[PDB]
UniProtKB/Swiss-Prot annotation, chain A:
Signal peptide: none annotated. This is Large ribosomal subunit protein uL14. It comes from Haloarcula marismortui (strain ATCC 43049 / DSM 3752 / JCM 8966 / VKM B-1809) (Halobacterium marismortui). Pfam families: Ribosomal_L14. The keyword Transmembrane helix does not apply. The L3/L14/L24e cluster may contact the 16S rRNA in 2 intersubunit bridges. Part of the 50S ribosomal subunit. Forms a cluster with proteins L3 and L24e. PROSITE patterns: RIBOSOMAL_L14. NCBIfam families: PRK08571.1, uL14_arch. Belongs to the universal ribosomal protein uL14 family. Gene3D superfamilies: Ribosomal protein L14. InterPro entries: Ribosomal_uL14, Ribosomal_uL14_arc, Ribosomal_uL14_CS, Ribosomal_uL14_sf.
Curated annotation (Swiss-Prot), chain B:
One of its GO terms (cellular component) is cytosolic large ribosomal subunit. It comes from Haloarcula marismortui (strain ATCC 43049 / DSM 3752 / JCM 8966 / VKM B-1809). GO terms for molecular function: mRNA binding; rRNA binding; structural constituent of ribosome. This is Large ribosomal subunit protein uL13. GO terms for biological process: negative regulation of translation; translation. Keywords: Ribonucleoprotein, Ribosomal protein, RNA-binding, rRNA-binding. Part of the 50S ribosomal subunit. Interacts weakly with proteins L3 and L6. This protein is one of the early assembly proteins of the 50S ribosomal subunit. Binds to 23S rRNA. Gene3D superfamilies: Ribosomal protein L13. The lineage of its organism: Archaea, Methanobacteriati, Methanobacteriota, Stenosarchaea group, Halobacteria. The gene is rpl13.
UniProtKB/Swiss-Prot annotation, chain C:
Part of the 50S ribosomal subunit. Interacts weakly with protein L13. Keywords: Ribonucleoprotein, Ribosomal protein, RNA-binding, rRNA-binding. GO terms for biological process: cytoplasmic translation. The keyword Chloroplast does not apply. The gene is rpl6. The keyword Magnesium does not apply. This protein binds to the 23S rRNA, and is important in its secondary structure. It is located near the subunit interface in the base of the L7/L12 stalk, and near the tRNA binding site of the peptidyltransferase center. It comes from Haloarcula marismortui (strain ATCC 43049 / DSM 3752 / JCM 8966 / VKM B-1809) (Halobacterium marismortui). GO terms for cellular component: cytosolic large ribosomal subunit. This is Large ribosomal subunit protein uL6. GO terms for molecular function: rRNA binding; structural constituent of ribosome. Belongs to the universal ribosomal protein uL6 family.
RNA sequence: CGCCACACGGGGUAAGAGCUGAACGCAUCUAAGCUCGAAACCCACUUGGAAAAGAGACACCGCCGAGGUCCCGCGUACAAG
RNA sequence: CGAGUGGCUUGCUACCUCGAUGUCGGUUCCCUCCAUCCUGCCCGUGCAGAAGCGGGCAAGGGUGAGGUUGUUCGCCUAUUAAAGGAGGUCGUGAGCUGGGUUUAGACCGUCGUGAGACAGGUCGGCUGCUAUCUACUGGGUGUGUAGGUGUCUGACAAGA
RNA sequence: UGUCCCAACGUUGGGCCCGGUGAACUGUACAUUCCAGUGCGGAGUCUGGAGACACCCAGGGGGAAGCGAAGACCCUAUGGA
RNA sequence: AGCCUGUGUACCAGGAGGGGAACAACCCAGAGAUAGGUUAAGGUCCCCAAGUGUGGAUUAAGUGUAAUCCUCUGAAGGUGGUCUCGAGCCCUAGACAGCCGGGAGGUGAGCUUAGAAGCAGCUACCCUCUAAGAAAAGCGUAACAGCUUACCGGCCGAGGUU
């Protein structure tokens, strides 16, 4: 993928439960897999800011609940490093459901998003209210 | 560094194994032998099969070790050792009375031992020790 | 057996050891003709290829040495020439001789130029869509010609559709 | 079942049907092919397939080789061509298999095979000088389906 | 089904034993291209700090933007090329032929060597030039040593000696180039060899950790879950199969870890100056203060503070040189805190 | 869990693409000869390595004194050594 | 239908071992094989392209995480370039585990007049030892080469 | 929630060095081995090669089909209970 | 099956010594002590005693350098790799191959068909010119065209073909 523009310490693994920062009807997401990733023996697959992931809906509306969907990580508690050396971290871990073309399924995003993610996924950004 | 050889052998265009055999025989009889122009010694056969055999010897080994020589210098010296009871007193004495050289470090020319000469005009299927060494990865210092 | 080749008047052939050198107004060529028990020599105004052995393998090489020598005679006099034509469909192919090698640009629309180094004292003259490879040594000339053609080889797609490339048009 | 199990003559002759029951039927469809209403004398050419080693040939092999042989003759000379071919051997030797360890191992009956000494004619065809190369090609196919190497020997036929 | 997994640790840096010379020894040199020149220099590690640089890379989306980069500060005072050794090519490889020494020696070079009192610089030169005429001359190297005394933070006064190859141009020309340097007094500087922005390979003897177990030394796992409470926590499962009936040298075991020679490739030189611009408030921890000739290497360098590190023009650079990077800031903030 | 660094290029081949070329007047990539061609082979690079028994090379110092040991203050080192 | 190679499965034999060579599965750690799953380079195509399908050279490197089950195998899920197979006493208990198998307690079904059984199921149920030799990982002292200091060479050896 | 990803740093007692005290297990012999082979088919000792200068310290336990118990399983005995 | 179970015999068991790398029963050999000599099996380039023996041929794969065998594999099938022996036919009235030239008229046969003209199918398959030349052997065309084979001649010059 296109360079992210920041160094990321993945703060999530397969099985992590995260916030769904949109209005798709899904409230909580469970990380199932990480796009393009391949680990090593005994390593739990990890994901962080900017990664595209496959998820299953843990909490939300009946219709969304249990559906296996694609998403993009927009916020994470573990710090990331920017070119100027400064570390940046968020209040929670969150992702945004997205389709085959990487367009957000929802109409609105909830909470801030990291600029780095905004740059990589434009249509996702053109849905954000706050870009940090 | 000065080897008082009673005999100087010229291995150029000479079948390695045949020279090695006569040299081992002489060393056991008390002769101090210097083999010269080892890089030009020769070994008959199909180059590709000969090389495979020497490469296999290089690949063999383990912790106990199977240090096989790559230079024509050592290849030839080893060929001679295999014709001497180098682990017996008399055998090690003979072996240590033999030395092989790249080129000719002496002023005298070496003699060509009878029955060891190869005729290039009559043979095309053979290889040079120097060619083997280069293939093995040796540093062509000659 | 033995075969005698009368050397042309335009030509003069010398030879030391296993190497034979042939010189003419078109240049010179030197080759090594080494095979077990086959003696090649220049006896006056003739070249002699002989052997005491007459088995199939020996006869094979003798016949091979003859043609090599007759070819050398021809090369130093008449010379050797291969003709080539550059064909292309969509992307115009730029073929130029730069230094000791022939460079081909925009082949199939590629950004990276393809190239090969000319062999020996072979000459490669290009005129529009036509190429002419020539020289005294048929080996070097034949290879350079072949090399140019091979240089536009494609294994990835159907050749019946993608035919761009330079092809040997005339063989000497 | 592999032929390696029965190709050799390493057992007594076992043919007596008065002391053997349950013998499977032979898979050999015919022993006389071509025009059997005609004599072999009426032909200029006679070619045989000679077995080069002594062996046992299971009826399943005789049928495969014979079939692939005659099959070719039919496809080249016609379902009525002017030729005739004979499979002169019959599978008299009954075979067993011990299919309980080595205890009371005398095997149950499982088939039949023909014993053939090296140099014998397994098949023999009779044709016209024309179809001589067709019968030779039929045998090439036949010997590819029987254990031993064979010779394609031409008997009457001086049209070389 | 027993998943695959690469082995633990590399088999290319063995045996993992204590280094023989604390002073690094390059086993390879740059190729001959430019004009003659000494292919290396040396200094003493002081510590680290960071700097803000203007992105240099022309292919980087950030070209022309601020960028914080970690740097290790190395004190690189002038050294003394005290002699010129010639090598001859022999059937057994290269061998020292002779040496051409000087007269002017640093006041304390005698803490390591028996300094020459009587030497013939021309006889030596003579023999060397004849070797070249004969065509038996192998590369040319300078015997070099440091001047620890010029570095206060380093207790040591005893100079560290190392041979450094001279390459570039024609042998005749670089031979004369070599004699030139030596004869002066051999005094040369970091400036005479490297320019900020070029890539250098740095070699040094890593920090010593004494005896360490397989987990730390080879990176093998610790025993897991229930297997961690039975009496084994940091021991590998087994030393090998039933057969072969022996322990292979390839299974990870305990032993010396650290104090090994390492040659780190492609270290970008951020800046070569002199003075105390890079020194840190309160002083580099466990070192002292810098105020003299220094070099700023991008990133990390093997060895603890005070160890001798060696520089050599990169022998396998991956990137073209982007000379004299613009430095907009050099942190002088205390390293304690 | 953080940060830094970890080629490009040569050489010889396999399968394969070809050149010249007989045996076999032709044809033929092969029989002799040759041009190419793999993450693979060798070199390149890193690490160890005078106990390599052919047990190595160079320079200087010293044989009434060069150098070294004990001793003492200490760690860039360290389980003893 | 015919001819073979292997020694991963199963069967057969009773050659070795009953004054004991501890079992299955898993785990950890190391080496290997190629009949190649991916990666490199090729040939063919019912090869336009993209992609498939089949074939060749090739063992450098890689071949991962999870749900049921003691399971091996396998079924299943999402990832992946691919998520290949096999040998090393079915590598590995003087390394681990003890779920399964495989004592002594107990229950069910079936069988047995009964004691009791079952190549069925089920709950519980113990893992000793200070390393002599050898092997290897690292560390020293001596002898040999034959006064000292400093600098090197590079036969060999290891690497993905 | 360090069971795990994936391991880190630290604490106390040992371990290591020194004074004193001071056992046991085990021992046909020889014994620096490694790769193959052979052999009652599972060899440090036989055969062929390879490697191997002696001694010592620490280590984790690959091998000595390691030590510890005249196999508990299975069969056999004109055995026992 | 280094399996099970007979039979005759010699061997191991209970049999040394020599050879077979090692190796109960494969080879020589049956053996008091000691000594000289000559052989046996097996071997004679070196390790290791004796040949780098002689006349001759084949093999280029390191095939092989392996009597027997749990132990030494190598099969069906295939081979213009190479050597040797034989049979038939053709040939200096010029063979085999290559190259050059000619490959022609009635007539695009008849039939079928809108059409088919060597070459969709069916039937026939005849004669002029001539040194040859099909009622056409293989591609090719919507059908023609076009390209070659047959067949004849030329250049060449010695074996060729089955
Ligand atoms: Cl996953
Ligand atoms: Cl080794
Ligand atoms: Cl010996
Ligand atoms: Cl030859
Ligand atoms: Cl574990
Ligand atoms: Cl007797
Ligand atoms: Cl060989
Ligand atoms: K037992
Ligand atoms: Mg696991
Ligand atoms: Mg700090
Ligand atoms: Mg701070
Ligand atoms: Mg038994
Ligand atoms: Mg393969
Ligand atoms: Mg495709
Ligand atoms: Mg491998
Ligand atoms: Mg298994
Ligand atoms: Mg096991
Ligand atoms: Mg064990
Ligand atoms: Mg245990
Ligand atoms: Mg224990
Ligand atoms: Mg249970
Ligand atoms: Mg009870
Ligand atoms: Mg239980
Ligand atoms: Mg045990
Ligand atoms: Mg008992
Ligand atoms: Mg019992
Ligand atoms: Mg009783
Ligand atoms: Mg007895
Ligand atoms: Mg002798
Ligand atoms: Mg062989
Ligand atoms: Na040979
Ligand atoms: Na080796
Ligand atoms: Na314990
Ligand atoms: Na075990
Ligand atoms: Na290459
Ligand atoms: Na088999
Ligand atoms: Na297990
Ligand atoms: Na591989
Ligand atoms: Na599972
Ligand atoms: Na076992
Ligand atoms: Na246990
Ligand atoms: Na187990
Ligand atoms: Na903890
Ligand atoms: Na052990
Ligand atoms: Na007897
Ligand atoms: Na013997
Ligand atoms: Na062989
Ligand atoms: Sr002799
Ligand atoms: Sr039988
Ligand atoms: Sr057959
Ligand atoms: Sr150095
Ligand atoms: Sr080195
Ligand atoms: Sr426990
Ligand atoms: Sr073993
Ligand atoms: Sr090829
Ligand atoms: Sr030494
Ligand atoms: Sr026992
Ligand atoms: Sr293979
Ligand atoms: Sr592939
Ligand atoms: Sr199952
Ligand atoms: Sr199993
Ligand atoms: Sr395993
Ligand atoms: Sr249990
Ligand atoms: Sr069960
Ligand atoms: Sr039960
Ligand atoms: Sr000694
Ligand atoms: Sr211990
Ligand atoms: Sr001879
Ligand atoms: Sr002979
Ligand atoms: Sr066996
Ligand atoms: Sr056999
Ligand atoms: Sr065969």
């Amino acid at each position: 993928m296109e360079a992210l523009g920041a160094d990321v310490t993945q703060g999530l693994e397969k099985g992590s439960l995260i916030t769904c920062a949109d209005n798709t009807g899904a409230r909580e997401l469970k990380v199932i897999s990480v796009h393009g990733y391949s680990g090593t023996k005994n390593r739990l697959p990890k994901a962080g800011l900017g990664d595209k992931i496959t998820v299953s809906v843990t909490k939300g509306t009946p219709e969304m609940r249990r559906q296996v969907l694609e998403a993009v990580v927009v916020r994470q508690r573990k710090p990331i490093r920017r070119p100027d050396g400064t570390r940046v971290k968020f209040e929670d871990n969150a992702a945004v459901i997205v389709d085959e073309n990487e367009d957000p399924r929802g109409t609105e995003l909830k909470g801030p998003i990291a600029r780095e993610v905004a740059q990589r996924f434009g249509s996702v950004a053109s849905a954000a209210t706050m870009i940090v | 560094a000065e080897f008082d050889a009673d005999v100087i052998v010229d291995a150029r265009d000479c079948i390695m194994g045949r020279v090695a055999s006569q040299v081992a025989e002489q060393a056991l009889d008390g002769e101090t032998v210097a083999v010269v122009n080892a890089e030009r010694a020769v070994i008959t056969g199909r180059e590709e099969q000969i090389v495979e055999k020497y490469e296999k010897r290089v690949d063999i080994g383990n912790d106990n070790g199977y240090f096989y020589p790559k230079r024509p210098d050592g290849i030839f010296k080893r060929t001679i050792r295999g014709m001497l009871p180098h682990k017996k007193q008399r055998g090690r004495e003979a072996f240590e009375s033999v030395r092989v050289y790249l080129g000719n470090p002496y002023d005298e020319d070496g003699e060509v031992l009878d029955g060891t000469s190869l005729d290039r005009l009559s043979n095309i299927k053979f290889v040079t020790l120097g060619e083997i060494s280069e293939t093995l990865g040796a540093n062509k210092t000659w | 057996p033995r075969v005698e080749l009368e050397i042309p008047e335009d030509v003069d052939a010398e030879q030391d050891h296993l190497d034979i050198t042939v010189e003419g107004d078109n240049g010179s060529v030197t080759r090594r003709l080494w095979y077990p028990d086959i003696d090649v020599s220049v006896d006056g105004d003739t070249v002699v290829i002989e052997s005491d052995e007459d088995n199939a393998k020996t006869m094979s090489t003798i016949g091979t040495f003859q043609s090599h020598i007759e070819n050398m005679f021809h090369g130093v006099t008449e010379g050797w020439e291969y003709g080539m034509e550059v064909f292309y469909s969509h992307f115009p192919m730029q073929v130029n001789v730069e230094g000791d090698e022939v460079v081909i640009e925009n082949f199939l629309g590629e950004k990276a130029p393809r190239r090969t180094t000319i062999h020996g004292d072979t000459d490669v003259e290009i005129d529009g869509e036509e190429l002419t490879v020539s020289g005294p040594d048929i080996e070097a000339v034949g290879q350079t010609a072949a090399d140019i053609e091979q240089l536009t080889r494609i294994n990835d797609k159907d050749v019946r559709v993608f035919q761009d490339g330079v092809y040997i048009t005339r063989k000497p | 079942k592999p032929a390696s199990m029965y190709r050799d003559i390493d057992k007594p002759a076992y043919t007596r049907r008065e002391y053997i029951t349950g013998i499977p039927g032979s898979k050999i469809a015919q022993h006389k092919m071509g025009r059997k209403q005609k004599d072999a004398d009426d032909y200029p050419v006679q070619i045989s397939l000679i077995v080069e080693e002594t062996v046992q040939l299971r009826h399943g092999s005789l049928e495969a080789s014979r079939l692939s042989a005659n099959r070719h003759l039919i496809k080249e000379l016609g379902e009525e061509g002017d030729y005739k071919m004979t499979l002169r051997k019959f599978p008299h030797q009954v075979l067993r298999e011990n299919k309980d360890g080595m205890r009371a191992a005398f095997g149950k009956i499982v088939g039949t095979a023909a014993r053939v000494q090296a140099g014998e004619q397994l098949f023999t065809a009779y044709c016209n000088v024309e179809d001589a190369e067709h019968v030779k090609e039929a045998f090439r196919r036949a010997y590819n389906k029987i254990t031993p190497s064979c010779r394609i020997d031409s008997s009457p036929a001086g049209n070389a | 089904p027993q998943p695959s997994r690469p082995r633990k640790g590399s088999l290319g840096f063995g045996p993992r034993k204590r280094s023989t010379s604390e002073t690094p020894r390059f086993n390879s040199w740059p190729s001959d291209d430019g004009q003659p020149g000494v292919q290396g220099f040396a200094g003493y590690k002081a510590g680290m700090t960071h700097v803000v640089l203007v992105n240099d890379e022309p292919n980087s989306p950030r070209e022309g933007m601020e960028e914080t980069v970690p740097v290790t500060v190395i004190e690189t005072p002038p050294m003394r090329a005290v002699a010129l050794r010639a090598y001859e090519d022999t059937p057994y490889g290269q061998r020292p032929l002779t040496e051409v020494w000087t007269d002017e020696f640093h006041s304390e070079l005698d803490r390591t060597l028996d300094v020459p009192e009587d030497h013939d610089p021309d006889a030596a030169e003579e023999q060397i030039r004849d070797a070249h005429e004969a065509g038996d001359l192998g590369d040319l190297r300078l015997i070099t040593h440091t001047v620890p005394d010029a570095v206060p933070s380093v207790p040591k006064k005893k100079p560290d000696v190392m041979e450094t190859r001279v390459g570039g141009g024609s042998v005749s020309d670089r031979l004369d180039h070599a004699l030139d340097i030596v004869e002066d007094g051999g005094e040369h500087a970091m400036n005479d060899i490297f320019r900020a922005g070029e890539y250098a390979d740095v070699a040094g003897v890593t920090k010593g950790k004494g005896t360490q177990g397989p987990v730390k030394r080879w990176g093998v796992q610790k025993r897991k879950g229930k297997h961690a409470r039975q009496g084994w926590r940091r021991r590998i499962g087994n030393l090998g199969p039933w057969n072969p009936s022996r322990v292979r040298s390839t299974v990870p075991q305990q032993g010396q870890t650290g104090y090994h020679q390492r040659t780190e490739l492609n270290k970008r030189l951020i800046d070569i100056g002199e003075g105390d611009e890079p020194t840190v408030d309160g002083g580099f921890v466990n070192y002292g203060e810098v105020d003299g000739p220094y070099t700023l290497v991008k990133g990390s360098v093997p060895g603890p503070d005070k160890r001798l590190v060696r520089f050599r023009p990169a022998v396998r650079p991956n990137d073209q040189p982007r000379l004299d990077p613009e430095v907009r800031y050099v942190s002088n903030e205390s390293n304690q805190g």
